[PDB]
Design a protein around this ligand. Structure first.
Ligand SMILES: NC(=O)c1ccc[n+]([C@@H]2O[C@H](COP(=O)([O-])OP(=O)(O)OC[C@H]3O[C@@H](n4cnc5c(N)ncnc54)[C@H](OP(=O)(O)O)[C@@H]3O)[C@@H](O)[C@H]2O)c1
Ligand SMILES: NC(=O)c1ccc[n+]([C@@H]2O[C@H](COP(=O)([O-])OP(=O)(O)OC[C@H]3O[C@@H](n4cnc5c(N)ncnc54)[C@H](OP(=O)(O)O)[C@@H]3O)[C@@H](O)[C@H]2O)c1
Ligand SMILES: NC(=O)c1ccc[n+]([C@@H]2O[C@H](COP(=O)([O-])OP(=O)(O)OC[C@H]3O[C@@H](n4cnc5c(N)ncnc54)[C@H](OP(=O)(O)O)[C@@H]3O)[C@@H](O)[C@H]2O)c1
Ligand SMILES: NC(=O)c1ccc[n+]([C@@H]2O[C@H](COP(=O)([O-])OP(=O)(O)OC[C@H]3O[C@@H](n4cnc5c(N)ncnc54)[C@H](OP(=O)(O)O)[C@@H]3O)[C@@H](O)[C@H]2O)c1
Ligand SMILES: CCCCCCc1ccc(Oc2ccccc2)c(O)c1
Ligand SMILES: CCCCCCc1ccc(Oc2ccccc2)c(O)c1
Ligand SMILES: CCCCCCc1ccc(Oc2ccccc2)c(O)c1
Ligand SMILES: CCCCCCc1ccc(Oc2ccccc2)c(O)c1
Ligand SMILES: N[C@@H](CCC(=O)O)C(=O)O
Ligand SMILES: N[C@@H](CCC(=O)O)C(=O)O
Ligand SMILES: N[C@@H](CCC(=O)O)C(=O)O
Ligand SMILES: N[C@@H](CCC(=O)O)C(=O)O
Ligand SMILES: N[C@@H](CCC(=O)O)C(=O)O
Lengths: 254, 254, 255, 255
C-alpha cells in the first residue's frame, strides 16, 4: 500500500513505455506520482495516458538529463510543488541507432559517450538532486538489461552503458546507504517499446526467450511495475545494491 | 495481500528462526500457513508461537528431510488436510559444529555429504513433492547465505552446501518453469539464531556488517519475511532462478 | 613456461580422449615428471599404452578410487615414497548416473545426488588434504569444471549442482591453503567429445551451438585445456588463486 | 610461452613502477619485440631510461593520447609501417581527476564521469579497432582492470564505474572480433604501488587488508601481472576470450 507516498517517474514516452507499466502499478497502489519527460510529444502523450490513472492531477516536468540545470531545477521545483518524495523510478536510456547494430568495435567516441551520459551518468545526478527531497531516506530504482552482464549480439554500446549503470547503482547504494536511501536495478526481459524498435534483431530475441527461458513466455511492463513497487516500498527494506531480473528466468540459464 | 493463499513453512525451531519472520509477515498478510519441523522441541515452540499469529488452526507436520518417506508422506498428508498450496518457504540447513571453524581442507566425507543432503538435496525432493500440490503454479523460496558465492572464513562446509543449493534453485527454476512454479533464493545477512551459534566468528561478522555494509546496520528476520512475501506472491511474477540479497547491500561491496 | 624438475599428479585419464590426457601431453612436452591415477583396470591399460607417446621415462601409475579415503590416503603416501614431493595435482574426475543426466532435475534421487557430490566435488577436498603433505614449499591444484555449474544448462542436471559445489570447493580450498602457498583454481572447459560426454543428454546439440554462437565460433580441445593447465600449474600464474578460467571459446561471456 | 618472432604494443608505461613495465620485462625476457606508447613527454623520457634494462635492440616509441581519435589512428598506422604486423596489445590506461577518487560518488560531475569513461573504457574500443588492422592472422588484446569494476569499493568511486564499463567493453570486443581470431581479455590486478595509485583515497589501508585477508596473505606485484599477461597474449591461452583473470592473491574469491 502506497497511500501518502510520492514517487517521481522518469522516462514515459507512450502507452508502451516500461515506466508507464511502473506508473499503473504504483497508481493502483495509491501513490501520488510526478512525471518527467524530455520531448514535447511525450508531454502530450503523458497528458492522455494520465486519464487512465487516478492521479487527481497532472504533475509534469520537462527534464532532459543531459542538462545539469534542468535536472537541478526540475527536482527543486518538484520539491516546491509536492514536498518530500519517497523515491525515483529511472527509466531513461539512449544510444544512436547506427551504434545498435553491426560491429561494436566501430562505435564512435561521440556515440559511446552519449550512451554513457544519458544511460548511466543521469542516474548519478538524479540521485544527488533527489536526495535533497528525501531527508528521512527513500528508494531509487533504475532499469537495466542482461546485456550489461554478458555480451549480447547487437546491443553493443548500450551493453557497456548498462554495465556502467549497474555499477553506478552499486556505488550509489554504498554512498547513499547511510542516508537511508536504497538504490537498485530491475533487469527487465525484452519488451516491445519505442526504444526497442531501435535495437538490431529485437524480435529474434523475443522468440528465443519464449523458447529457452524457464517460464517459456515473455514479461510485460506491468511485471516490471510489480517488482518496482516492491523495490520502492518498505517490503524491500534491507535490499540495496541489488539487480533483480524480471525476465522469466532467462538470466539463470545458458 | 495473501488472503486465500496457503504456504508451507519449513524449519522454524524457535522465535528467532528466520522462518518465523517469514511466518509473521505472511500471517499478517492473511496467508493460511502450514508448518513442518524435525525435533520435538521445535513442535513445542511452534505451538506456543502460533498464539501470536492469526492462524486459526495449527497445521503442524514432522518432516526430517533426510528421509524421503517423511517428505513424501508429509506433503501428501498436507494436501489431504489443506488442499493445494501456493508455495513453500524452505529454511532448513545443518552441518556438524567442527565443520564451521578451523580448516576446510580437513572436512570429513560424512560431514561434507551430511551438509549437502540436508541443506541442498532437501530442496529438490521438497520441490518434487510440493509440485503435486501446485497444479496451477506457485512459488518456492530457499534461504541461502553469501558464503555460497564467496569463501568466507569459518563458514566452510556450509559454503559449499549453499553453492550447491543456489545451483539447485537455478536447475529447479529451469525444470519447473514450464509448470508455472517459480524457484528463488533469499541470501540473508547474518541474524542471531540458534544455528548461527554453531558458526565460528559469527559475532565478528555481525559487527563488520554494521561497519561496512551500505546501510550500516544488520537485517532482521522480518526483513527476510518481507522479501519472502514478495517472492511467494504474484508481485514477483516473471522472477525465477533469482538470488535476492537481504543483507543491507553487503553483497555489492568489497 | 618450463617444467623440468617439477612433478604433477594427474587424476582421471580413461583413454586418449580424456581432458586429462590433453593435460598430460602438454605437461610432458614441457619437461614435467608425471604420475597418473586411475580407477578402472581398463584405464590403467589405456594409460600404459598412452605412455609410449610421452617423454616419461617411467610409468608411475596408482589406483585411486576417490570414493575411498583409504585409497586416497594410501595412494598419495605411496606416491610420496616413490617420487618425493610434488608440485601440483590436476584433478579431472567426475561421475553421475545416466539415470540422472537427462529428463527432469526435480526427479533426481538422493543417492544419485550424493554420488555426484561425493565423486565430483568432495574428492577434491580430500585429495587437496593428502597432496598438501607432498607440497611443503607450496604447489598448485587444478580441477576441471563446466559452465553448467554457474548456470542451469538443460540436461546437465545433477552434474550442474555438483559443479556449483566443486567451484565453491575450489574457493574454500584456496582460502584455506593460501597461507601454505598452495593455489587452487578451476578450468571451466567447453564441451569436448570424451567417454563421459557420451552420457550427457543433448551433448551434440550444445557442441553445435558453441560453433554457431561462441565468440571464437569453434569448439575447444583437450590440448587447449592442457595449455591453460600448464599456466595454472606453473609459476606463470603465481598471484592467481580461487579463480575459474573459462577455456570455452568465449561462450561464458555471452547470452 | 616462447615469444620470439612476436611483437606486442604496450600502452601506458609512465615509470619503473607502472604495471605495464612489469608486462614489458616479462614479455621482453621471453624474447618478444615491443612497441611502447605514451602520453606525456616525461613518460617517453622514462621509457628511454628503462629500455636500457630490457633486451630490445631498438626503441619503438609512439606518443598516443587516447582522447584523440587521430592520434590513436595515426599512431597505430605508423606502428604498422615501422614494425609491420603485431601479435597483440596490452592496454594499461586509465585516468580520473583526484576529487572524484574520494568522498561522495553521488557528487561526481558529468565532466569527471565522462572523462574517466573516455580514457579508461572507450580508449579500448578504438585501440582494438585500429590494432585489428595490424592483426590479419589474429592476435590478443588484454586490458587492466580492478575489482572495483565488479563491486563498490569505497573511494574508487568514478573509476569503478569506468572499470565496469571497461570489463563489459572487453566482453563486447571479444564477441565482435572473435570471428577474426582476435582474443580480448582483462587482468584484474590487486593493488600495486604506482603513480596512479597515489591518487586513490584509502589505497594504503587496502594494501594492508590484502595481506591480512587475501588467501595468499600477501600483495601482488607488476611482474606477477606480466606473467599472466604473457599467458593471455600467447598461444597458451588459445580458447580463452571475454575472460577476466584476477591476479590478486585470491582476494576476489573471499568475502
Ligand atoms: N523495452 C525493453 O526490452 C527494455 C529491456 C530492458 C531495459 N530497458 C530499459 O528501460 C528503460 C526505458 O526504455 P523503454 O523500453 O521503456 O523505452 P521508451 O518507452 O522508448 O523509453 C525511453 C525513454 O527514455 C527517455 N529519454 C531518452 N533520452 C532522454 C533524455 N536525454 N532525457 C530524458 N529522457 C530521455 C525517453 O524520453 P523522450 O521520448 O521524451 O525523449 C523515453 O521516455 C531504458 O532504460 C531501457 O534501456 C528496456
Ligand atoms: N541466521 C543466519 O545468519 C543465516 C544467514 C543466511 C542464511 N541462513 C539460513 O537460514 C535457514 C534457517 O536457519 P536459521 O538461522 O533460521 O536457524 P534455525 O532457527 O536454527 O533453523 C534451522 C532449521 O533447520 C531445521 N533442520 C535442520 N536439519 C533438519 C532436518 N534434517 N530435517 C528437517 N529440518 C531440519 C531445524 O529444525 P530442528 O531444530 O527441528 O532440527 C531448524 O528449524 C538456514 O538454511 C540457514 O542456513 C541463516
Ligand atoms: N568432456 C567435456 O565436454 C567436459 C567439459 C567440462 C568439464 N569436464 C570435466 O572434465 C573432467 C574429465 O572428464 P572427461 O570429459 O575427460 O571424461 P573421461 O575421460 O570420461 O574422464 C572422467 C574420469 O573420471 C574418472 N573417475 C570417475 N569416477 C571416479 C572415481 N570414483 N575414482 C577415480 N576416478 C574416477 C574416470 O576414471 P575411470 O575410467 O577409471 O572410472 C575417468 O578417468 C570431469 O571432471 C568432467 O566433469 C568435461
Ligand atoms: N596500481 C594498481 O593497484 C592497479 C590495480 C588494478 C588496475 N590498475 C590499472 O592499471 C593500469 C595502469 O595503471 P598503473 O597503476 O600502472 O598506473 P600508471 O603507472 O600511472 O599508468 C597509468 C598510465 O595511463 C596513461 N594515460 C592516462 N591517460 C592517458 C591518455 N589520455 N592517453 C594515453 N595514455 C594515458 C598514463 O600515461 P601518461 O603518464 O604518459 O599520461 C600512464 O602511463 C590502469 O588501467 C589502472 O586502472 C592499477
Ligand atoms: C539484442 C537486442 C536484445 C533486446 C534488447 C532489450 C532492450 C530493449 C530496449 C532498450 O532500451 C533502449 C535500447 C537502446 C537504446 C535506448 C534504449 C533496452 O535497453 C534493452
Ligand atoms: C562466517 C560467519 C558468517 C555468518 C554466517 C551467517 C549464517 C548463520 C547461520 C546459518 O545457518 C546455519 C549454519 C550452519 C549450520 C546450519 C545452519 C547460515 O547458513 C549462515
Ligand atoms: C547439456 C550439457 C552440455 C555439454 C556437457 C559438457 C560436459 C561433458 C562431460 C562432462 O563430464 C561428465 C559429465 C557427466 C558425468 C560425469 C562426467 C562434463 O562435466 C561436462
Ligand atoms: C580504494 C581502492 C584502492 C585500491 C586501488 C587499486 C588501483 C590503483 C590504481 C589504479 O589506477 C588508477 C586509478 C585512478 C585513476 C587512474 C588510474 C586502479 O585502477 C586501481
Ligand atoms: N548464545 C550466546 C548467549 C546465550 C543465548 O541466550 O542463546 C552465548 O553463546 O553466550
Ligand atoms: N569459538 C569462537 C571461535 C574460535 C573457534 O571456533 O575455535 C567463536 O564462536 O567465535
Ligand atoms: N540421449 C540423447 C538425448 C535424449 C535423452 O537422453 O533423453 C542424446 O544424447 O542426444
Ligand atoms: N596468440 C594469438 C595468435 C597467435 C599469435 O599471433 O601469437 C591467439 O592465440 O589468438
Ligand atoms: N588521500 C588520503 C585521505 C584523502 C581524504 O581525506 O579525502 C588517504 O591516504 O586516505
Amino acid at each position: 500500500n502506497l497511500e501518502n507516498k510520492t514517487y517521481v517517474i522518469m522516462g514515459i514516452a507512450n502507452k508502451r513505455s516500461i515506466a508507464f507499466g511502473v506508473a499503473k502499478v504504483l497508481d493502483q497502489l495509491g501513490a501520488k506520482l510526478v512525471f518527467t519527460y524530455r520531448k514535447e510529444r511525450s508531454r502530450k502523450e503523458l497528458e492522455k495516458l494520465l486519464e487512465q490513472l487516478n492521479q487527481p492531477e497532472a504533475h509534469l516536468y520537462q527534464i532532459d538529463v543531459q542538462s545539469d540545470e534542468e535536472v537541478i531545477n526540475g527536482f527543486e521545483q518538484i520539491g516546491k510543488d509536492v514536498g518530500n518524495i519517497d523515491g525515483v523510478y529511472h527509466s531513461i536510456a539512449f544510444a544512436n541507432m547506427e551504434d545498435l547494430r553491426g560491429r561494436f568495435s566501430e562505435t564512435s567516441r561521440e556515440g559511446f559517450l552519449l550512451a554513457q551520459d544519458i544511460s548511466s551518468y543521469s542516474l548519478t545526478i538524479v540521485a544527488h538532486e533527489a536526495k535533497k527531497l528525501m531527508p528521512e531516506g527513500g528508494s531509487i530504482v533504475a532499469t537495466t538489461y542482461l546485456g550489461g552482464e554478458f555480451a549480447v549480439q547487437n546491443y553493443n554500446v548500450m551493453g557497456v552503458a548498462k554495465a556502467s549503470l549497474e555499477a553506478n547503482v552499486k556505488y550509489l547504494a554504498l554512498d547513499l546507504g547511510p542516508d537511508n536511501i536504497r538504490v537498485n536495478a530491475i533487469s527487465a526481459g525484452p519488451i516491445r517499446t519505442l526504444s526497442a524498435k531501435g535495437v538490431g534483431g529485437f524480435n529474434t530475441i523475443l522468440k528465443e526467450i519464449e523458447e529457452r527461458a524457464p517460464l517459456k513466455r515473455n514479461v510485460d511492463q506491468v511485471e516490471v511495475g510489480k517488482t518496482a513497487a516492491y523495490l520502492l516500498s518498505d517490503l524491500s527494506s534491507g535490499v540495496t545494491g541489488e539487480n533483480i531480473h524480471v525476465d522469466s528466468g532467462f538470466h539463470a540459464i545458458k
